[PDB]
Amino acid sequence: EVETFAFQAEIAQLMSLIINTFYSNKEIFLRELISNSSDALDKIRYESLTDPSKLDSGKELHINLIPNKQDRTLTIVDTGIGMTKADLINNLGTIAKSGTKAFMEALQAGADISMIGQFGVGFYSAYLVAEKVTVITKHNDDEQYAWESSAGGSFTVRTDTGEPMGRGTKVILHLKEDQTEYLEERRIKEIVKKHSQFIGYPITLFVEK
Numbered sequence: 001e002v003e004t005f006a007f008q009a010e011i012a013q014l015m016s017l018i019i020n021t022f023y024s025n026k027e028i029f030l031r032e033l034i035s036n037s038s039d040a041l042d043k044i045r046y047e048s049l050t051d052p053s054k055l056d057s058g059k060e061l062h063i064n065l066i067p068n069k070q071d072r073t074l075t076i077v078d079t080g081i082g083m084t085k086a087d088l089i090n091n092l093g094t095i096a097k098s099g100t101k102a103f104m105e106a107l108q109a110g111a112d113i114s115m116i117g118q119f120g121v122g123f124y125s126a127y128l129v130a131e132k133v134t135v136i137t138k139h140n141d142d143e144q145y146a147w148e149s150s151a152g153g154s155f156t157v158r159t160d161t162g163e164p165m166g167r168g169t170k171v172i173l174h175l176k177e178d179q180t181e182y183l184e185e186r187r188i189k190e191i192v193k194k195h196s197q198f199i200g201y202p203i204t205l206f207v208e209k
Ligand SMILES: CNC(=S)N[C@@H]1C[C@@H]2CC[C@H]1C2
Pocket: 036, 087, 088, 089, 092, 093, 096, 120, 121, 122, 123, 124, 135, 147
């Protein structure tokens, strides 16, 4: 079922800093998640050039933004390369240790949280607006997995039994109560056009009721 892991001490520090620091420019989280999505889409497109079989799990390379007001969730779906089990628990956390160390020294020097992406740890800016983050992912060499955390120093991983994704990553943001503005269409449009206008993949914004 569900395995529980401790964050590395430095990543827990980062999440606590992002969660507790007073910083009003929260909308930068979307640019970071979209940029992470566009990087995962580049990687699968480059790999499929020398091996077209990597696209049997889906030829489309796009990003979907799905707001859900009934669940108070904002979901970022990309059909990129996805992540394996070792990526969730070990590989990506080892890379993020040096980026997090460099990010804290830059913050002590006068930098601000909006520059989190320049240090490779941009995903954690989801905790500017989310009380809990679910990450569903499927890589060609592994099974589908669900990653989840509410900060507090721990995260969980389980094998996902939901709808199969084919290939890619789905980030579900369970928004905090005062951040429901990022479920509105005109608001998401404003943030995309301002921060992600030149992404080289179709960004389709879903609408609701
Ligand atoms: C680019 N990915 C980063 S920065 N982090 C990883 C994504 C998932 C959440 C934490 C790990 C697993």
